[PDB]
From a paper:
SRD5A1 and -2 are mainly involved in the metabolism of steroid hormones, whereas SRD5A3 converts polyprenol into dolichol for the early steps of protein N-linked glycosylation. Both SRD5A1 and -2 are endoplasmic reticulum membrane-embedded and utilize NADPH as a hydride (H−) donor for the Δ4 reduction reactions. In this work, we report the crystal structure of PbSRD5A from Proteobacteria bacterium and homology-based structural models of human HsSRD5A1 and -2. PbSRD5A shared 60.6% and 51.5% sequence similarities with HsSRD5A1 and -2, respectively.
After extensive crystallization trails, the crystals of PbSRD5A in space group C2221 yielded in several conditions under monoolein lipid using lipidic cubic phase crystallization method and diffracted x-ray to 2.0 Å resolution. The connecting sequence between TM1 and TM2 adapted a short β strand (β1–2), which formed antiparallel β-sheets with the corresponding strand β3-4 linking TM3 and TM4. With most amino acids assigned in the electron density map, two omitted electron densities were clearly visible in the central cavity near the cytoplasmic side. NADPH perfectly fitted into one of the densities mainly coordinated by TM5-7 of PbSRD5A. NADPH formed extensive hydrogen bonds with N159, D163, and R170 on TM5, N192, Y193, and E196 on TM6, and T219, N222, R226, and H230 on TM7. The other elongated strip density was modeled with the crystallization lipid monoolein, whose alkenyl “tail” is accommodated well in the hydrophobic pocket majorly composed by the residues located on TM1-4. In the substrate-free PbSRD5A structure, Y87 donates a hydrogen bond to a water molecule, which in turn hydrogen bonded with E54. Intriguingly, the movements of TM1s, combined with the observation of significantly large B factor value of TM1 in PbSRD5A structure, suggested that the TM1 may play important roles in the substrate entering and releasing.
Author numbering: 3 to 253
């Protein structure tokens, strides 16, 4: 029960800290940063769907295994999770312009396993044990603000990935300078949105599992945004010098 939960959290935190350090130097080898020599590859679209599926599925499974699956605040938190992950699993990958037709299996296995552990941990902290997400929490500003940051970051992430989709007609592999929306300010507003999103999750849940996931998302996307930003500035002599990588007007 709680033994596995604490060990899952320790391992996720450890993995996030070590990922942060390494990703400042070597970006995760998918997308524009996919090189040779990363082992066997798999179809890119199937990898995205298969690797993300544990997050909505294992979360719902463990959620329902908790006594408090019938409580209002847990059910609102389930709504936020599934809003994200039904989009991440069954909208984003189906519409994406895939570029390279294959992607490294090792990266997709990491994501699959991460989502298994992270999905279970986050649901476990909500509906199991004592009810901490009472109706009093619904009247706590931390839940309200957290939920609004969740939805704001989610919305920005969705809007940002949609703009990217149209930079490629289906079947194309080209990269274009993204423009409009928040690209007016940062190279990776999709990453900005998702970072803010899971910070909002951490606030609304007030669980160690939510906090570790907000930390892990930052640990992973913040160095990736810097690598994307560096990539843009060397691929395009054209690229706006005023843009930051992730944080408007900062980095
Ligand atoms: N929570 C987390 O820790 C993580 C979650 N995510 C989320 O999942 C989503 C996918 O992330 P990720 O794939 O890294 O996002 P990217 O922005 O790197 O790529 C998303 C899609 O847009 C395409 N694309 C990106 N830039 C351009 C461009 N300049 N011109 C044309 N097409 C472009 C990519 O094609 P191509 O792949 O060929 O570059 C890909 O299909 C994001 O919303 C992200 O926040 C992903 C990683 C970690
Ligand atoms: C009370 C409500 C509870 C609901 C909780 C679970 C929600 C289930 C639905 C998930 C799909 C959401 C997807 C949001 C729309 C996707 C936006 C998008 O990507 O569209 C791009 C456009 O079609 C071209 O670029
Ligand atoms: C050199 C690498 C340093 C090691 C540390 C980095 C590990 C990569 C992140 C794993 C967590 C995944 C959790 C969130 C899912 C992200 C989706 C993804 O990872 O990309 C998949 C790929 O595009 C299609 O298979
Ligand atoms: C997909 C699911 C999306 C979920 C989106 C969640 C957004 C929550 C935002 C604000 C919370 C509302 C505050 C709740 C107000 C309760 C106040 C109260 O306790 O009632 C008044 C009392 O009767 C007088 O004494
Ligand atoms: C209950 C909620 C009801 C709505 C649930 C899902 C809507 C799915 C939204 C996605 C609609 C697909 C639109 C499309 O096909 O656009 C592809 C385009 O190539 C990309 O730019
Ligand atoms: C849900 C509200 C935000 C969804 C953003 C979105 O999917 O639409 C962006 C549009 O396709 C690009 O202009
Ligand atoms: C870009 C703007 C980002 C948005 C800015 C907001 C940042 C908030 C970050 C995390 C929420 C903090 C909550 C983390 C603490 C959760 C764990 C906890 O404290 O409760 C466990 C309890 O003590 C049983 O031991």
């Amino acid at each position: 029960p709680d033994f596995l939960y604490r060990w899952a959290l320790i391992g996720l935190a450890a993995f996030g800290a070590f990922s942060f350090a390494t990703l400042f130097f070597v970006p995760a080898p998918y997308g524009r940063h996919q090189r040779g020599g990363w082992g066997p590859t798999v179809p890119t679209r199937l990898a995205w769907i298969a690797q993300e599926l544990p997050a909505p599925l294992v979360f719902a499974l463990v959620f329902a295994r908790g006594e408090h699956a019938d409580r209002l605040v847990p059910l609102l938190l389930l709504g936020l999770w599934q809003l994200h992950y039904l989009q991440r699993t069954f909208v984003f990958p189906l519409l994406m312009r895939v570029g390279a037709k294959r992607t490294p299996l090792v990266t997709a296995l990491l994501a699959f396993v991460f989502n298994c552990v992270n999905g279970a941990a986050n649901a476990y902290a909500i509906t199991h044990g004592a009810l901490r997400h009472t109706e009093a929490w619904l009247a706590d500003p931390r839940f309200a603000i957290g939920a609004l940051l969740f939805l704001g970051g989610w919305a920005l992430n969705l809007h940002s990935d949609a703009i990217l989709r149209r930079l490629r007609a289906p079947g194309e592999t080209r990269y274009e300078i993204p423009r409009g929306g928040a690209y007016r300010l940062v190279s990776c507003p999709n990453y900005l949105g998702e970072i803010v999103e899971w910070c909002g999750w951490a606030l609304a849940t007030w669980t160690y599992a939510g906090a570790v996931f907000a930390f892990f998302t930052f640990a992973n996307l913040f160095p990736r945004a810097l690598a994307h930003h560096r990539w843009y500035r060397e691929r395009f002599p054209d690229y706006p010098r005023e843009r930051k990588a992730v944080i408007p007007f900062v980095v």
